[PDB]
Design a protein around this nucleic acid. Structure first.
Ligand SMILES: Nc1ccn([C@H]2CC[C@@H](COP(=O)(O)OP(=O)(O)OP(=O)(O)O)O2)c(=O)n1
Ligand SMILES: [Ca+2]
Ligand SMILES: [Ca+2]
Length: 343
DNA sequence: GGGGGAAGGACTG
DNA sequence: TTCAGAGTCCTTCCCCC
């Protein structure tokens, strides 16, 4: 069983350059604006030409312009990218029936019984990595191994515009050299904890006791990690499925007064139902972002589907349920639906 | 007595 | 006065056929 991981080199900012040729040869920064502060918002992405100086996705636009002020800041357009991605996913779909799309710029391929060895697999990464670069003019990084996790790591190492292959003899090697947070699934927090205790490489975990690991990161986190070092990871490539389609916005405000939030919720509660397709959610939650970070949420599950209007109503009771439980103003407010109806 | 629901946190990425 | 913008899965926890 050998996997083929695909990762769009560096998506957004890249597509933005593909459409506007007068961009390349410059540090581009695709980000999200809110309409406030003046330059309020965060960074969604940036080309490698812009990363060099630190402008990494997720930071305040005000900071970005603190390091790379001359760079090229372009507004985010999830609509434009969505379509591109939607196209690339379809190609890969012809190379292997068993496909699994993770995010908007990722996809796992299973070639187990359509490839003889890592030799003709690396040749396939190319045959693919190319059909892509010129049919959509998008560069991508490919990863290959015996499973999804290692396949995804080989792609991390080889980026950008590359491809790598983590063979078995190499795997055992990585399980020793591969370290800290460079592990898919383990976030900064879990890392700033493990490190403090000496655990650096994915192996250091084996010199512990499953329980002493659980008491600090969790049974899932641990079991997962120990499943890697032990080298017995399973997880197959199955078709993905939308579980929770939601939408959130941002108030130029920072309010607490219902009619100073109702229009907002209503707004989001509109866009979400457009993505719901022909789905019927039995569950709905109102996510609310405050000011001093920390998000708050209140939701409810129904024994039947939901109609837009049905949503509007509960939205309020769920919002009041929030306010009366916190003494801080709100900045962004949103809603998320789930538990769609089966077959 | 494993599961459904609700609020929180983290990693997505 | 007024910072940093979609979806999944793990968890602490209370509760019931
Ligand atoms: N805080 C973040 C981080 C990433 N993304 C977006 C960036 C596009 C998509 C995938 O991100 P990555 O793959 O991590 O980066 P990339 O630039 O898309 O590509 P690469 O992984 O090769 O750097 O998710 C985002 O919306 N918010
Ligand atoms: Ca990518
Ligand atoms: Ca990615």
């Amino acid at each position: 069983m050998i996997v083929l991981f695909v990762d769009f080199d560096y998506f957004y900012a890249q597509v933005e350059e593909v459409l506007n040729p007068s961009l390349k040869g410059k540090p581009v920064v695709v980000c999200v604006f809110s309409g406030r502060f003046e330059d309020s918002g965060a960074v969604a992405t940036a080309n490698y030409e812009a990363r060099k100086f630190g402008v990494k996705a997720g930071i305040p636009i005000v900071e970005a312009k603190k390091i790379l002020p001359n760079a090229v800041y372009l507004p985010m357009r999830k609509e434009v990218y969505q379509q591109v991605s939607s196209r690339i996913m379809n190609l890969l779909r012809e190379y292997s029936e068993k496909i699994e799309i993770a995010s908007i710029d990722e996809a796992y391929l299973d070639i187990s019984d359509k490839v003889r060895d890592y030799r003709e697999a690396y040749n396939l990464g190319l045959e693919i990595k190319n059909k892509i670069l010129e049919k959509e003019k998008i560069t991508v990084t490919v990863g290959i191994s015996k499973n999804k996790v290692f396949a995804k790591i080989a792609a991390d190492m080889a980026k950008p515009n590359g491809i790598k292959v983590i063979d078995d003899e190499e795997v055992k090697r990585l399980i020793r050299e591969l370290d800290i947070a460079d592990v898919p699934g383990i976030g900064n927090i879990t890392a700033e904890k493990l490190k403090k205790l000496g655990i650096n490489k994915l192996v250091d975990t084996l010199s512990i006791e499953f329980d002493k690991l659980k008491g600090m990161i969790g049974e899932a986190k641990a079991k997962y990690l120990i499943s890697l070092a032990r080298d017995e990871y399973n997880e197959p490539i199955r078709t993905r499925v939308r579980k929770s389609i939601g939408r959130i916005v941002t108030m130029k405000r920072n309010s607490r007064n219902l009619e100073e939030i109702k229009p907002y919720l209503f707004r989001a509660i509109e866009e979400s139902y457009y993505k719901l397709d022909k789905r019927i959610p039995k569950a709905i939650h109102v996510v609310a972002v405050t000011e001093d970070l920390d998000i708050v949420s209140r939701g409810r599950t129904f024994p039947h589907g939901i109609s837009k209007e049905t949503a509007y109503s509960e939205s309020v009771k769920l919002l009041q349920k929030i306010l009366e439980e916190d003494e801080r103003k709100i900045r962004r407010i949103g809603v998320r639906f789930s538990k769609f109806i089966e077959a």
